[PDB]
Each structure stands twice: as structure tokens, then as C-alpha cells.
Amino acid sequence: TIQPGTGYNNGYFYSYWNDGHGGVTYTNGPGGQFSVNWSNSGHFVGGKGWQPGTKNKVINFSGSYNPNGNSYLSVYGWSRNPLIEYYIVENFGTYNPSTGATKLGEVTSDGSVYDIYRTQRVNQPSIIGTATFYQYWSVRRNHRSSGSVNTANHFNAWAQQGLTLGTMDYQIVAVEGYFSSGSASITVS
């Protein structure tokens, strides 16, 4: 496993964060590859991509994703000004992260309809410190662990619906887990 933090590996930005509970390892592999193995973890997020992201990136991902419990596989990132945490969720485990959330539309992209949602985090950690901020979600109806994500289709649909993004910060393909178990091996480009 690697030390939690951010950096570059084989031409890709990476971020690996966890809450210190234990039970998760993250490794960077060749090119855009990373692996995550977890067993009765706490909360963590790890993956590879870009710093900064862009608003018209086509992101390719390939591999295996085998959660047992609460986890997501997403294009994940942030903007600043406004501060937004966003997800284009391609697959998940026992919990659909939009459960109970306000639906803000639909968008069709890359072979599936996605449902769009907005949620709010109140006084929570963020890339700029503790803050209250919105999260934007596109949740894929047809789950998969490989594919291509045309981010513009999402960002444009979000904007159409009044979900504005600021200046991009990082943008990765991430495996997130919340007190669960699993394995994943994903290659980004």
C-alpha cells in the first residue's frame, strides 16, 4: 500500500485518502492503473486521473470492481468558486448514493441514461477546509466497470439544470468505500 496523500505516478495524478480506521490498501500500478483491496474498512477514496481536470475530458476506465457493501466507482472531482464535489457514478455496491436525494433531471451518455441529483454537505471537510457545499451526481442506470465517460455531457446537463461548476480542481476515476469490503483494479486514460 502507499501512504495516503496525493502525487503523480506514471503520468497520472493520484489521490488516496482514508479516515484512519484501517482495513484498506491502495496501490499505484503501471500507466493509469491502480488497485484497492479492503476488508471492514472505514471511509476511503482513491484513484488516478488529472490535476486539474477539464470540462471536456473523455475519460476511459477499464477493469474489475467487486464491492461487498457500501462503495462507489465514479469519475470524481471538485471545482472551486463555487466549491462543488461531483460524481459520475458508473457502479456501486449496496447503497445508491442518490437515495433520498432531489432528482434534477436525466442525461443520456455513453450507452446509458443517468439520473441527476443535487445534495448538500453541511460543515464537512473539503479541498478548502470545513465548509458547506453542494454535491452534483449523475448516477448510471446500467452499471459497469469499464467504459468511456464524456464528461462534457454531464457538466453541460448539470449546467442546463442550474448546477454550476467553478474552476476545476482534481478529476479522477475513484473507488470510494464506506465501512465495507471489496477489491478493485482499474486502469484510467
UniProtKB/Swiss-Prot annotation:
Variation of activity with pH: Optimum pH is 4.5-5.5. Stable from pH 3.0 to 8.5 at room temperature and from pH 4.0 to 7.5 at 40 degrees Celsius.
Annotated glycan sites: N37, N60
Keywords: Carbohydrate metabolism, Glycoprotein, Glycosidase, Hydrolase, Polysaccharide degradation, Pyrrolidone carboxylic acid, Secreted, Signal, Xylan degradation
Tree of life domain: Eukaryota
Secreted in keyword set: yes
Induction, as annotated: Induced by D-xylose, dependent on the cellulase and xylanase regulator xyr1. Repressed by glucose through negative regulation by the crabon catabolite repressor cre1.
Function: Glycoside hydrolase involved in the hydrolysis of xylan, a major plant cell wall hemicellulose made up of 1,4-beta-linked D-xylopyranose residues. Catalyzes the endohydrolysis of the main-chain 1,4-beta-glycosidic bonds connecting the xylose subunits yielding various xylooligosaccharides and xylose. The catalysis proceeds by a double-displacement reaction mechanism with a putative covalent glycosyl-enzyme intermediate, with retention of the anomeric configuration. Produces xylobiose and xylose as the main degradation products.
Protein name (record): Endo-1,4-beta-xylanase 2
Gene, per the UniProt record: xyn2
